[model samples]
Target chain A: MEALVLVGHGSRLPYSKELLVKLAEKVKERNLFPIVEIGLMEFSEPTIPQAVKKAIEQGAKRIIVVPVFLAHGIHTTRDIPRLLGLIEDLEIPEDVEIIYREPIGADDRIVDIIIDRAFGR
Target chain B: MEALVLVGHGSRLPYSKELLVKLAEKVKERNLFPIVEIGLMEFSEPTIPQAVKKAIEQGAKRIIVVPVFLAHGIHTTRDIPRLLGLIEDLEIPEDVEIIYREPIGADDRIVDIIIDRAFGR
Candidate 1:
């Protein structure tokens, strides 16, 4: 089955991490995808490799990685893609399809949510 | 009355905006402050000045601009404080105290949330 991975930039502040975790729960509750698991790109535990390895251990054949970042910043363009390249070096079997989608922060759907809270005339 | 303004680094992607709005709702529900309002710093409508002016229009005397950002990055150290300086230069009368707090992403409370999701210890 396909497994979903949510990657957050992670943080030194505990509250920040808490927010991400709650967000991950929200994503799961929203049923954005099946088999969702969160991982950190930097400054936290359970790095991307570890998250993917865990999925592999859990009998996942295909993996879909979703970056929970804001915009296509340096991390998205350079860091994350580089990490995926490292994973490629590991030589996973051909049966597994490790695909990555764009980061969530830039999606157009978010505009409505922000405007909804604005004061009405 | 005192007003809390939560500022987010607005995004072009709608889904990212939606995520911030949801997070703002969560903050409001937590009762962390008595009166809370959200605003985007850039790349969206209702900039910081607009948000601050709105708070003034809503009869707010003292305003607390809380940046919903990660770390004391460029925005927090340079941009936000500069905006506040502009407001200060406006020469508002009365006991209008605007205190700038640290960014949310670095707070320790976030760490607990991230670790809570860990499986099997």
Candidate 2:
């Protein structure tokens, strides 16, 4: 089966975790993936390993791990890869396949938000 | 007159600056703000101070400095505020009013993008 995993950089501030959870819920509302999960990098629960494992338990074989980051920093390029077993650790089982997507670097729709925040709402 | 300034976290990678420039142009094309400027927080020209000064020069009385950030971390809450003179060093002139907006925390449209990245599009 297919699944989606949103990798979020957790923060001490509750806002980060809350936002990630909301994003996961919103994605789930789309009815896209049979299993949609959120895995925080630090400062919270449902860690990367735990969330990925849950997807596996839910019968997910091909999982896409999307980083919910603004920039493609070290955290996304290095740390996240290691957690997902794409780098060196090889935490995930050999049977499972993980595909990593780029962070939310730039998008046309994001410009709309910038304009809204600057003036409208 | 009013103006919009997008404060971006510049990177050594060209993508960061390109995205910021596009965002500014997109906002400018909206015809809402009389002037729209893009400034990198670091790693490039047109720094925050330079962009804010340009808006002031262009007869902007009220300028909104919007951080093109995803989360409200120290960079958004503390570093940005300090750069905009909301903290200690008052870099901007007294006459020009600089309004800071919240980062793109948890927008509904962003959820749409997340879902798109996860499966669709």
Candidate 3:
């Protein structure tokens, strides 16, 4: 089974972490993936590696990791890849594939969110 | 004229800041506000106060302040409001009304974006 992982730069604040949890639930509700999980980069439990390991154990031969960030910060551009073993050596089963996606970048849909928030809709 | 202020948790990274610049450009292109500015909460210049001052000087009677964040973390719930003087008594002019809005919370559109990224769109 293919799984989807949402990675976040976790914070000490609850809502920051909670946002991703909600996203995972909402995404799971859509049945986009048989397995959907959220992993924190730091400052919380279930690190990216842990999340990925669980996914693979649950029969995920293919995994897509998407960043739940607003932009390509150092966390997305450099730090996350290092943690995911994309840029550095880390233990992963040779057969399990990890597909990384870009962080939430500048897009028209994001602009719409900004407008919606501005207008209080 | 009304102005829109987009607040960000700044980083040492370039693309992190660049996202807001591009968002401001796109939002401005939409002509929603006569003035739009990007402000960093910390780690950079053009703070929220500076953005608001510029907007007021440029004839903004009503200003909408929105945090370009995914959740109501400490920065969004506490720090940003303090910076905008909603929680603390800062020197925003009496006549220039500053309307604060919520951070980008868990939304269906955001979930769609997550799926899009996961599917390699």
Which candidate has the highest DockQ of all? 3
lDDT per residue for candidate 1 within B32-117, as digits (tens), equals 55566677877876577777777777788878776655445556766677777733323233446676765543223332222222
TM-score of each: 0.53, 0.88, 0.93
- Runs of candidate 1 exceeding 4 Å displacement: A30-34, A86-91, A116-121, B1-121
Tell me the lDDT of model 3 at B65: 94
lDDT of 2 at A118: 75
lDDT of 2 by residue, B1-121 (tens): 8888899888776667877887777777767878888889878877988888888888998888888987787778888788878887555567777899878878988987876676535
Worst 10-residue lDDT window for candidate 3 chain B reads B84-93
TM-scores (chain A) of the candidates: 0.78, 0.92, 0.90
lDDT of 1 by residue, A1-121 (tens): 7777767676665544565676567656655444777778778876877777777777788777665554556566667766666333234667776776665442233332222223110
The pairs that clash in candidate 2 are: none
Task: Please give the DockQ score of every candidate, comma-separated.
Answer: 0.09, 0.54, 0.82
Q: Please state the error at residue A81 of candidate 2 in Å.
A: 2.5
The CAPRI-style docking tier of model 1 reads incorrect
> Poorest 10 consecutive residues of model 2 chain B by lDDT?
B112-121
Q: What fraction of the reference interface contacts is present in each model, in order?
A: 0.04, 0.47, 0.85
| C-alpha lDDT (0 to 100) for residue A52 of candidate 3 | 90
